[PDB]
Amino acid sequence: PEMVRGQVFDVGPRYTNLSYIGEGAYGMVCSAYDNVNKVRVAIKKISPFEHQTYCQRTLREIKILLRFRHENIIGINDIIRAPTIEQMKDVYIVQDLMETDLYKLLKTQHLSNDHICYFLYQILRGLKYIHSANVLHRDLKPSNLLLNTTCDLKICDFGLARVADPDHDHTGFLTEYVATRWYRAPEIMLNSKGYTKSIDIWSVGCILAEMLSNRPIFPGKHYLDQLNHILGILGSPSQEDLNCIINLKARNYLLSLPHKNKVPWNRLFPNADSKALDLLDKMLTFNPHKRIEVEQALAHPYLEQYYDPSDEPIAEAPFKFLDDLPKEKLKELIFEETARFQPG
Ligand SMILES: CN(C(=O)CN1Cc2ccc(-c3nc(NC4CCOCC4)ncc3Cl)cc2C1=O)C(C)(C)C
C-alpha cells in the first residue's frame, strides 16, 4: 500500500505514484497515475460506512454518475473496493483529473466576458442533461464546477442530488436545509424543500453573478440572513408573488419588512454585458414559477454564439426513482452498485 498524509490508499496495482490534492469531510482526494490508460486521474477515498447520511450521499452519487454520460458532467471511470462486504471499509471512486475549479479560479483570476459566456454555456448544457433525467443537483456552486487547462467545465458532487418531486415541494417557514447557504433560492427559507428544477437555476444565477464580480452576490452569515441579502438586491416581492406564498408565517414575515427597492443589475455590475444581465435577472427571479428554465436559458441571446440544441443532449434513461434505509442496508446497495468494476 502507498500512504498519503498518513492514510492508506489501497488503490494498486492499477493506480500508482500518488500526489496529495486535498481533503474534506467526504474523504481524501489524490491524483494517481493510471497504468492501464497511462494518464493521471483523481481518486477519492470515501469512508462512509459508520454513518447513514454519508452512505446516502455516496450511493446517490454512484448511481447517478454511473447512469449519466455527458461532456459537462464528471464521470466515474473505476470504483475500487474490497471483494467482500465484510472486508469493505472504504470505496475509492476514480474520476478524470481536472486542473482546478471555479471557486479557486474566481479567487485568483479576472474572467473575460468570453470566459463567462463559455462557462455559463457549459454549466447550462450539463444542467439540461441532469434536469432531462428528472434529477436535481441541489448544491451547484463554484467549487462543484471543475475546469481543465483549456477551460472545459464539468459538474461534480452529486451527494445532495434528488429525483425531482414538485408535488411534494411545500414546507413551512424556516425549515432547515442542507445545501450551501449562499446559493439557496429564497423559497428554501419560505416554503420549499428544494424538490423542483427551479432550485438549481437560482444557484446558477448566483454563480453567473459571482463570475461577473469575483464575489458571492448573497453571502448570508446564517439561515435567515441569506433571505434578507436576496431581498436587499431584488427588493420587496410584489403582491402577486406574495400571494403565491400561502403559508401565513412566511407571508407575514415578508409583509413585516420595510419596503425595499430593487438594486439595478447594471449598478452592481457596471462592466457586465447587458445580455448577461438580462439572463441574470431571469435566473434570479424571486418567484420560482416565473424563473427561467434551463432550456430557455440556453436559448437566451447572451448564449447565441454557442446555442445549438442538436448538440445539447438529453438523458436516454431518466430516473423514475431511499431515505429510510439503515447504513448496513446502504453498504449492501453500495457493494452491489460497484460490482461491475471488480475483476470478473
Ligand atoms: C461529498 N462527496 C464528494 O466526493 C465531493 N467531492 C469532493 C471532491 C474533491 C475533488 C474532486 C476532483 N477534483 C479534481 N481536481 C481538483 C484539483 C485541485 O483543484 C481543484 C480541483 N479533479 C477531479 C475531481 Cl473528481 C471532486 C470532489 C467531489 O465530488 C461524496 C463523497 C460523493 C458524498
Side-chain angles (χ1 to χ4, degrees), residues 1-319 321 324-344:
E2 291 194 40
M3 303 269 191
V4 180
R5 307 297 188 278
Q7 294 286 272
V8 179
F9 249 60
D10 287 315
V11 304
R14 178 161 175 182
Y15 303 100
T16 60
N17 188 21
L18 313 174
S19 300
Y20 177 82
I21 286 168
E23 190 230 287
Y26 71 91
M28 184 181 287
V29 70
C30 289
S31 54
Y33 186 64
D34 188 346
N35 289 109
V36 169
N37 294 152
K38 166 159 193 179
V39 292
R40 295 190 69 75
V41 297
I43 307 185
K44 65 206 189 175
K45 180 185 193 178
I46 310 314
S47 295
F49 296 120
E50 295 195 32
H51 205 259
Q52 190 232 321
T53 64
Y54 310 142
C55 293
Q56 271 178 329
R57 291 181 183 173
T58 298
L59 178 59
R60 290 184 199 289
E61 166 143 304
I62 289 166
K63 286 188 83 94
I64 293 160
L65 294 188
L66 292 176
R67 181 96 70 91
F68 285 1
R69 187 178 191 80
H70 190 281
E71 296 178 351
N72 304 115
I73 304 171
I74 195 70
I76 292 176
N77 305 346
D78 195 7
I79 302 174
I80 304 142
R81 48 83 165 153
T84 63
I85 312 217
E86 299 86 345
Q87 300 171 291
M88 179 169 69
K89 280 189 143 76
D90 307 296
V91 181
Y92 299 91
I93 299 166
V94 184
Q95 306 180 277
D96 290 341
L97 179 58
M98 300 295 276
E99 187 220 21
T100 193
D101 65 48
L102 189 62
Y103 176 88
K104 291 181 154 202
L105 198 62
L106 288 178
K107 76 200 178 197
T108 59
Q109 299 305 323
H110 171 73
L111 305 201
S112 72
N113 181 48
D114 290 326
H115 280 90
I116 293 170
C117 191
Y118 182 51
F119 292 153
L120 182 65
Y121 179 67
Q122 292 182 89
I123 295 163
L124 288 168
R125 178 170 182 265
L127 193 65
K128 177 185 173 181
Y129 182 97
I130 296 168
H131 284 184
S132 80
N134 205 38
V135 172
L136 311 173
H137 182 283
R138 301 172 77 250
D139 200 17
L140 297 167
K141 55 182 174 174
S143 65
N144 285 342
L145 306 172
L146 305 172
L147 300 152
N148 72 6
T149 61
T150 47
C151 300
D152 298 302
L153 182 149
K154 294 184 189 301
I155 298 163
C156 74
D157 190 359
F158 285 76
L160 296 184
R162 291 291 199 281
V163 174
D165 187 6
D167 301 336
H168 296 256
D169 188 62
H170 191 277
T171 190
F173 181 46
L174 307 172
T175 290
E176 298 299 340
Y177 198 67
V178 295
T180 312
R181 187 191 308 117
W182 296 349
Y183 303 91
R184 289 178 191 160
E187 62 269 21
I188 292 298
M189 286 76 73
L190 295 169
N191 69 349
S192 176
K193 294 191 175 87
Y195 292 173
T196 68
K197 290 171 183 183
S198 64
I199 200 70
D200 286 332
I201 296 293
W202 179 272
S203 304
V204 176
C206 292
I207 294 161
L208 170 57
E210 194 165 346
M211 290 196 282
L212 291 166
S213 68
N214 298 79
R215 296 163 115 75
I217 182 173
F218 304 126
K221 298 207 219 68
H222 50 259
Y223 183 91
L224 193 49
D225 191 40
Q226 189 57 34
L227 175 57
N228 309 321
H229 272 260
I230 298 167
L231 298 178
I233 293 311
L234 273 50
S236 304
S238 66
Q239 179 67 264
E240 188 166 290
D241 289 351
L242 271 173
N243 297 163
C244 304
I245 300 168
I246 201 178
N247 180 269
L248 282 162
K249 278 176 179 186
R251 187 159 164 287
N252 283 332
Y253 173 69
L254 296 165
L255 289 172
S256 80
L257 298 175
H259 178 207
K260 288 159 197 158
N261 307 101
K262 183 166 190 71
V263 175
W265 300 115
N266 65 2
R267 292 184 213 154
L268 287 162
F269 303 111
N271 301 319
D273 185 284
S274 63
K275 298 177 185 170
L277 298 181
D278 187 73
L279 181 48
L280 180 59
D281 182 62
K282 288 172 166 58
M283 294 175 141
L284 297 182
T285 297
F286 178 85
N287 190 332
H289 300 110
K290 294 179 178 165
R291 200 170 296 152
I292 197 167
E293 301 201 338
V294 68
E295 297 171 300
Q296 279 173 298
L298 282 162
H300 188 278
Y302 181 58
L303 299 176
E304 181 179 355
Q305 296 164 308
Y306 290 106
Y307 179 56
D308 177 2
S310 80
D311 192 32
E312 289 157 8
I314 58 170
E316 299 183 351
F319 282 86
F321 255 10
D324 206 84
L325 307 182
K327 65 185 178 181
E328 289 71 18
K329 173 60 182 181
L330 297 161
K331 190 172 186 183
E332 287 177 35
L333 292 183
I334 289 160
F335 190 84
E336 290 165 53
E337 199 64 32
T338 64
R340 75 169 75 174
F341 296 104
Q342 291 298 121

